[PDB]
Design an enzyme around this catalytic site. Structure first.
Site, PDB file in Angstrom:
ATOM      1  N   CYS A  90       0.728  -1.222  -0.126  1.00 31.13           N
ATOM      2  CA  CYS A  90      -0.095  -0.081  -0.137  1.00 31.13           C
ATOM      3  C   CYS A  90       0.856   1.313  -0.070  1.00 31.13           C
ATOM      4  O   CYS A  90       0.561   2.361  -0.782  1.00 31.13           O
ATOM      5  CB  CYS A  90      -0.985   0.024   1.433  1.00 31.13           C
ATOM      6  SG  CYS A  90      -1.655  -1.571   1.310  1.00 31.13           S
ATOM      7  N   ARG A 103      -7.835  -4.595  -2.513  1.00 27.58           N
ATOM      8  CA  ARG A 103      -7.387  -3.305  -3.566  1.00 27.58           C
ATOM      9  C   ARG A 103      -8.579  -2.825  -4.483  1.00 27.58           C
ATOM     10  O   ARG A 103      -8.567  -3.367  -5.592  1.00 27.58           O
ATOM     11  CB  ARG A 103      -6.296  -3.760  -4.079  1.00 27.58           C
ATOM     12  CG  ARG A 103      -4.989  -3.816  -3.064  1.00 27.58           C
ATOM     13  CD  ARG A 103      -3.708  -3.914  -3.648  1.00 27.58           C
ATOM     14  NE  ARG A 103      -2.691  -4.507  -2.683  1.00 27.58           N
ATOM     15  CZ  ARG A 103      -2.253  -3.834  -1.544  1.00 27.58           C
ATOM     16  NH1 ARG A 103      -2.421  -2.541  -1.564  1.00 27.58           N
ATOM     17  NH2 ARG A 103      -1.354  -4.451  -0.807  1.00 27.58           N
TER      18      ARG A 103
END
Lengths: 208, 208, 208, 208, 208, 208, 208, 208, 208
Positions: free
Chosen positions: G45, G121
């Site tokens: 991330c 995601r």
């Protein structure tokens, strides 16, 4: 629930001018045409029974039995049959199902929206294994075409024998007449094997 | 819920090879024959479209429009129509409804038990006021008889005009041929007025 | 839900050999006997209609109309009435309700457990204000006693006129014959006023 | 749920002036007439019990037992029976069911819309196998005709013996008097066998 | 739902040996004792009615009316009252509610588990504003103590007048005899004000 | 219900241009990319199939099979594949699932809100054990990036082999390029063991 | 319920590192990319946020705002952003939605089957009118390709401007490169107008 | 349903040693501590009431009223208070709610799993606007710490006044003692404004 | 459903900074204090962890383990613990449960009405057999008193050992100081045995 093409005809026992009959099974290697008419002693239904009885042996030669049905009492059926035998000079040779209350009529979707008191002109074609093959709902006010029912049995039986499909208006198709059609290929392997045959790879015809 | 004889054809908007169409209403003083076929580029459905397009003007002379329907994409309809125009030398002059997902097909009970992926050969005859007049479910494997659809429209229209009823196999009835039938009397007053006419009081015939 | 003594006869419109009839109301100051029979062209039901038509004027003199009912088509009613008129030499002068499907028959509890195809021999007596006054369910296999229906209307009407109650087998009661009975006292005041009259204070009889 | 013609009389145990009784079964090869009356010490119900007790042996000669029923306490039944024995000089020889709260009365549909406090004049005829054969609902205000109950048992028993059907007002039918009727033919074979017999093929009569 | 101490007596209209009565309201400034008994012509219930009628004026002097109730017909009530008047030489001066079917009996929880056919010996004491003040369910087999009902009305009325509470077995309490009791203090302020009075601060007695 | 990352791909049998296929299982040690397109003979879907077939061997070298899907008839698939083979000079080497009615399409959430007649551009990546690893819903109007599907399979497979995690835009990450990332520590023991390595204890990278 | 392509993005108010934001509306003439990541201080991330912030102005030049989302507390977001600013030398210029409890995450179907504690995601592309245009679910373990998100916005915006459709891998399509595609014809009139143009009538390309 | 921190205290009327009290509202600008104890005349509950009454004026100086509660009769409360006043020489100056049946006790979740007959040692702190601010469930067997309730009111009130948050064991925190804490910043703007202050940007302390 | 005093702590497996932990059982002969805090990196929660870690050995000497809980990711826990170790110079020696999504938090009623995004300051005290012994809900805005948790464990453990009950503010009760209380007598036999001991028969104290 209302039967459809491919489903087996529902088990049911009915009371007819020929006694009791157990419906999908007593005809377990024959075809049969179960058909409804609004009521006995109506004129159009009479012409239909005349036509069926006159053409009865073409139905027999295709191994199918006829069996009629109406919301009239089985005594009224007998009196209708007797009137036909003596005014139109022909003996009605098939059973007529008596169903007042309309229990078997509602079960086969034979009561429609235009009369709450009588069936329409329904026609079911059941085959030798009891599956529903063809369904016709004609209205009260026009009679049926009986030669079209015969034409459909011939075609349906040819399909079961030769694994083919009949063209439109067969055996009088304006493109291939008497000829029947090969069932279109299912995979891409099978399709390429038929390339450059007349019409196209999905439209191939033979003769029988 | 599945429409029946006498009910009005359900309001619905459909997307066809001729654009959008609003179904019971855009045909609000004409008759029309809504009919389904399993899929484009199948052979039997092709013979049926050929036959319909060749006989199109008899449909027009009876004030009825044709409109087809299948679970195939509207681009595939256009490519099917183009193949027909150039191999069979005839132009398909009526709209074909495209319904993938089958929403309008399920609403008219056109999907049966023998294929979960395509319609059967359903035929609806709707009149100038939008009421469903006649319902046919032919199976995938035999083509329809198009001259029988015409015969039924002629009879249904004669019924609306002359307040009569057509006999079986009309206009070729083995008892009265061309002649049509008087609708049977409703009360005992009316019945006695017709006594001693040919056949019987419920079975009286005229000519048109 | 099945009507009972004291309830008003349910609003319903029926189709009869005399046209349409609106049932509790078209008879709104007359009494009427609505009665069912299993089916036309059965023998016991024929004897019952013969008897009713022969005794029709005693029904008229008591201000009651007759009206029959069966699950047979209204054309079959007309043909039954015509057979009766010409074999038994009497004209059936009252309407016969045609109810195939049996909707009004089920609503009045006329279909029982012994036949799923026909009514029993039900008899309803409705008065000039439309309330159900008397209910008889005779089985298929024995005919009804028509003079007992008349006897009951006479008694029911005398009750409405004179505010009395009829004894058993009236007007032939083995204790008081023709005489009718005073409705028993409701409070202890009223009861003591009638002490020492013949039989007892709750059992007092007059003449009319 | 309310019993109907053809159903077996519901199993139930009741408390009567003759002790406990187990209702369909303690009478398991006899017929019996279960009948209700509004209440003890009413005058019309008294005339009915007088008439039943005077005619008791005609009921016995037809192998049927009587059994009454009311929403009154079983002590009040005994005091009513004692009043009848000493004022009308006859001994009530059959049991009277006591049902306050009306549990068995509601179960047989004996409480109607015109009184919430007492039964109507219901009459059930049960046969030797316990099936309900005949149902009468007379209102409070007119007494019953007891000779008509006897007439119906005679006819119902003749039906079980000779497999026939009695005409209307039998044994006093205005067409065939004492004679009984042959049950109409069920199939078209059977019907033609009876052609040209008096009246018609569905209406044939013999004697017993 | 079954009424309880403090609730208002349910609105209901009943039919009694003195006519119709509208139950909580026709007694709208008097007290009344509604009490049930199993049935008329039972012996224990007779002794209870004798005792009530002999003591009727003590009930009247306390401004309370008596009203009885049983599942017996109102004619049987009248015949029971007449038997009492002439064998025990006393006239029953209060109304007796007739409730067959037991609708008002079930509504007041008067039918228990030991008989499905009769009430128990229920006693309700209703005051001048219609609230249920006291409930007794005695069984069938022992009669009630009528002087205890009077004792309870006296005490209940003294409570309404003097805002006190009666001791046990009042007016014969083994601690304070005739004297009545002060309602115990509700807050701690009020309690301390009564300290060092005889017995204790929650147990203080006066005289009336 | 619509499948999600981690769930096993639902058992289902489908009919494709290569015959029947049993979907999660016939690919039980390979990866496969199930992907939908709106319809055959649309232009964008054609460019997508061209691109897939040209890049087919990179899909094969990563042990993944391609399999397409649309609401078009399996005959139309064959005719689309034949058009591609002869106009764009490439043979489509993977199966195309035919699903009219859209049963498998609805089951995988491939029909969205912008067309009720066709799928969107859905992409599922299933691994050698049948678990759903990646889900893409592209709209009708833009074609997909096929090299991004390949990039994702490479990364997903490296994850299964080396127990690592790929950085953004891998193998072209602007911080660590080709290098992959160590899965962050789960407990405080494990975290302290990695202190003072480049970036931080949760952000450690190796090479493969 | 989980939003789909064509539906409007659900009204919702969220709490972000830039304050409160009202989600579909505060961006009511811009595009925006709402995207989730599993959690702050995870390594993959982080690379994704680095890449987004470095490419931020290409997002701005296409009139789209970025907005992130995770189940981490908004204080942890601030501490993550501060770590990124000082270790990777770049300032995260877009808001990050804090949603512990995961209410907005569940509403957008961002929690899948492989972790019950964090989002996947997910990537949503919303346009200037708030409709959901594109949905991506990448798994936890591989980072996203940010240049592919940009490529998709460019294409989606060109579609809205020129009413065209982009080919596969556009602007690098192996058949037509930079060129875009004409939306295929809808009726048979429109189709014939494009006959004999390169590829075929449904596959026509222009340049922009 | 059981109240929680932030919800308003449920409207309810209770009966206490000081009369009736309307619970959230009669204290509508004061704080109050509603607290339960198992039962009167238990020893631990006595020590708790002693402690509360001795510390009553510290509760008054913080503008809070005390109010107790138990499943004991309000007379038993008065006798308990009187025993305390005379054996422990202190007057209980606050109301005690009497709730037998435990209706208000169940509504506030004060009955737990270890006794079905008495409350636990619940403590609710309600503020001047009626919101529930703090909830304690101590078990039967250990008494409460009353100085900790005071400490919590002081802190809760300081929070409402100065918009701060108190540290652990305040006003005796082992890091900052008397000092209170600034509520951590909500956005990234606000956070950067506090950088380089002692501890960190989320952990800043002042004095009051 | 939310656990209460006396119930066993619910079986659940949690993921903590010390690995996995199986919650009621891995502590199956120790006591433990499960306590929640709103979130990591908030200031008040930091002072609470400082205080707990500084007082850790008094918790260990009473055979209880500490275990914290918050809706923050387990990586954020590790980073919070590392910040505490290096700014406040103390090592947090107990596990912290990570529960984003809040599944275990909702199960223990730790989310209240004032924040939908974080727990309150809940405290559960579980004993060596896993039963919930004490429940505290402190609000977000005031920190807890840790010495009061210790005081309660000491008292709860003394109760289990000596079968006594601790007075209020024990061991500093303003009536009996260090002394504990005898559990009040249960029957009247047992009560009289303790008459004339100091305070009263229900209030007797010893020393330990």
């Amino acid at each position: 629930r209302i039967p459809l093409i491919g489903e087996k005809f529902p088990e049911m026992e009915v009371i007819t001018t020929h006694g009791k009959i157990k419906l999908p099974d007593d005809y377990k290697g024959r075809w049969f045409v179960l058909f409804s008419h609004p009521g006995d002693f109506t004129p159009v239904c009479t012409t239909e029974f005349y036509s069926f009885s006159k053409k009865y042996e073409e139905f027999k030669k295709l191994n199918t039995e006829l069996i009629g049905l109406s919301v009239d009492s089985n005594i009224s059926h007998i009196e209708w049959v007797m009137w036909i035998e003596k005014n139109l000079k022909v003996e009605v040779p098939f059973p007529i199902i008596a169903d007042p209350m309309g229990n078997v009529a509602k079960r086969l979707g034979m009561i429609h929206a235009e009369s709450s008191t009588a069936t329409v002109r329904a026609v079911f074609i059941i085959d030798d294994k009891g599956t529903v093959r063809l369904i016709l709902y004609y209205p009260m006010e026009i009679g049926r075409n009986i030669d079209e029912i015969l034409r459909a049995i011939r075609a349906l039986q040819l399909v079961d024998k030769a694994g083919v499909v009949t063209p439109a208006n067969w055996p009088n198709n304006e493109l291939i007449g008497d000829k029947v059609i090969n069932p279109a290929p299912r995979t891409i392997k099978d399709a390429k094997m038929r390339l450059g045959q007349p019409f196209d790879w999905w439209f191939t015809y033979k003769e029988v």
